[PDB]
Amino acid sequence: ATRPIDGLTDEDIREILTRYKKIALVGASPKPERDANIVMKYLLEHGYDVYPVNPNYEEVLGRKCYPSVLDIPDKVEVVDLFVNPAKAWRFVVYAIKKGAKVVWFQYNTYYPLAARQAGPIIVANRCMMREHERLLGE
Amino acid sequence: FGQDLGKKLLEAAAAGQDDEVRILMANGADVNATDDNGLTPLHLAAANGQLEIVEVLLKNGADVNASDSAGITPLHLAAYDGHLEIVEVLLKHGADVNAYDRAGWTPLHLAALSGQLEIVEVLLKHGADVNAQDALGLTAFDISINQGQEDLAEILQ
Ligand SMILES: CC(C)(COP(=O)(O)OP(=O)(O)OC[C@H]1O[C@@H](n2cnc3c(N)ncnc32)[C@H](O)[C@@H]1OP(=O)(O)O)[C@@H](O)C(=O)NCCC(=O)NCCS
Ligand SMILES: CN(CC(=O)O)C(N)=O
């Protein structure tokens, strides 16, 4: 059930987590009950640049929050998705337009239309924090 | 204000907040409200496995066959996300067993993609088209084969 949907190897994931530092976090939220919140905190705490995306907030965890990925002025390398499977797949094309290298679908966010629209490398049914703990943790 | 109520209904339905859903509906929120891409409260409850909410939405007149701008139906989402009980209720309430999304996928294709044996069995019993082809000409069968699930492939032929 945390079985990856993608066919990538540990080394592929390791490269992604170490090569790229600039992460757009979609569905960022101040709510403690959203996993987007605990993951964003963990990424900030481990040296990543995180740009929260959610049209419902102006700021999340003390960083400016943007309505869409395209609105982010910074370079974006990875798009980390915390939105419904009915919704998340639409960000592949948005990521392509932004020049992102990777689109990462967290648990219960993937829908196969993401494949058809698909760089960019697709990571599917994995967690950035849990992968980082597993591969790069102390 | 209908947009405000619609956005809250969408969210409460997605979150499985049975009580908030009833409150919002008692307050005028429309079960057939849509977001910008055409998703409805029933799409989201189906996608997230909120069974009770699926039932109350339908009882209140929700369109079981609503499609978003990519042709995605509540049955498509329930099938891919592996929600068996929701699949059965949707079918019972008239869901089109052979709806095709933007990619040419039917619920049978989506069930095969995520390897849901029980859901495939149910769709077949309900007249799923075993011969249906997606945009690249592939049947549900083809898909399970490419994925090595030959136990699923055997009932999909
Ligand atoms: C996806 C998930 C959030 C469920 O979402 P949901 O209940 O269906 O709700 P939505 O996807 O519609 O929206 C979720 C959120 O992002 C937002 N959002 C909705 N649509 C959005 C969009 N198009 N663009 C940006 N943000 C959006 C919200 O407003 C929201 O947060 P909020 O509660 O503060 O308002 C949930 O299943 C999850 O967190 N999955 C990943 C879990 C994970 O991997 N945990 C492991 C950590 S180790
Ligand atoms: C690493 N880890 C330890 C545990 O599983 O006990 C966390 N983060 O949960």
Closest C-alpha to ligand 1, atom 34:
A29
Which ligand is located closest to the Cα atom of residue A138? 2
Torsion of CA B37, B43, B44, B46, to 10 degrees: -160
**Residue (of B101, B156, B99, B128) closest to A114 by Cα position:** B101
**Distances A78 to A98, A114, B7, B20, B58 between C-alpha atoms, Å:** 10, 15, 28, 35, 39
d(CA A116, CA B7): 29
d(CA B20, CA A95): 34
Which of A84, A112, A113 lies nearest to residue B47, judging by beta carbons? A84
| Closest CA–CA distance from residue A84 to any residue of chain B (Å) | 8
Which residues are paired to A51 by β-bridges? A24
Interface contact A86-B80, CB threshold 8 A:
no
Tell how far the Cα of A132 is from the centroid of ligand 2, in angstroms.
12
Q: What is the 3-state secondary structure (H, E, C) of A62-120?
A: CEECECCCCCCCCCCCEEEECCCHHHHCCHHHHHHHHCCCEEEECCCCCCCHHHHHCCC
What ligand 1 atom has the least distance to the C-alpha of A87? 23
Q: Give the pair of three-digit tokens for residue A25.
A: 């976090």
**Residue (of A108, A138, A110) closest to A123 by Cα position:** A110
d(CA A62, CA A60): 5
Tell how far the Cα of A135 is from the centroid of ligand 1, in angstroms.
25
Which of A:90-119 have CB within 8 Å of B? 90, 108, 111-113, 116
**Going edge to edge, which strands form the sheet with A121-124?**
A49-53, A22-26, A78-81, A102-105, A121-124
d(CA A41, CA A58): 17
Helix (H) or strand (E) holding B25: helix B18-26
d(CA B152, CA A29): 39
User: Residue ranges of the alpha helices (H) in B41-125?
Assistant: 41-48, 51-59, 74-80, 84-92, 107-113, 117-125
Cβ-based neighbours of A63, under 8 Å, separated by 6 or more: A44, A50, A51, A52
d(CA B26, CA A124): 39
Strand A63-64 relative to strand A78-81: parallel, antiparallel, unpaired?
unpaired
**Residue (of B12, B21, B39) closest to A86 by Cα position:** B39
Q: What was the experiment behind these coordinates?
A: X-ray
d(CA A126, CA A82): 11
What secondary structure does DSSP assign to B63-81, as a single string?
Answer: -TT---TT---HHHHHHHT
Q: Which domains does chain B have, with CATH numbers?
A: 1-157 (1.25.40.20)
Give the resolution in Å. Answer: 2.0
Interface contact B103-A116, CB threshold 8 A:
yes
How many other C-beta atoms lie within 10 A of the C-beta of residue B111? 31
d(CA A38, CA A132): 14
d(CA B45, CA A137): 36
Task: List phi, psi (to 5°) of B130.
Answer: -65, -20
d(CA B126, CA B124): 5
Exposed, middle or buried: residue B15 (CB in 10 Å: 0-12, 13-18, 19+)? middle
Q: Which domains does chain A have, with CATH numbers?
A: 1-138 (3.40.50.720)
Closest C-alpha to ligand 1, atom 28:
A27
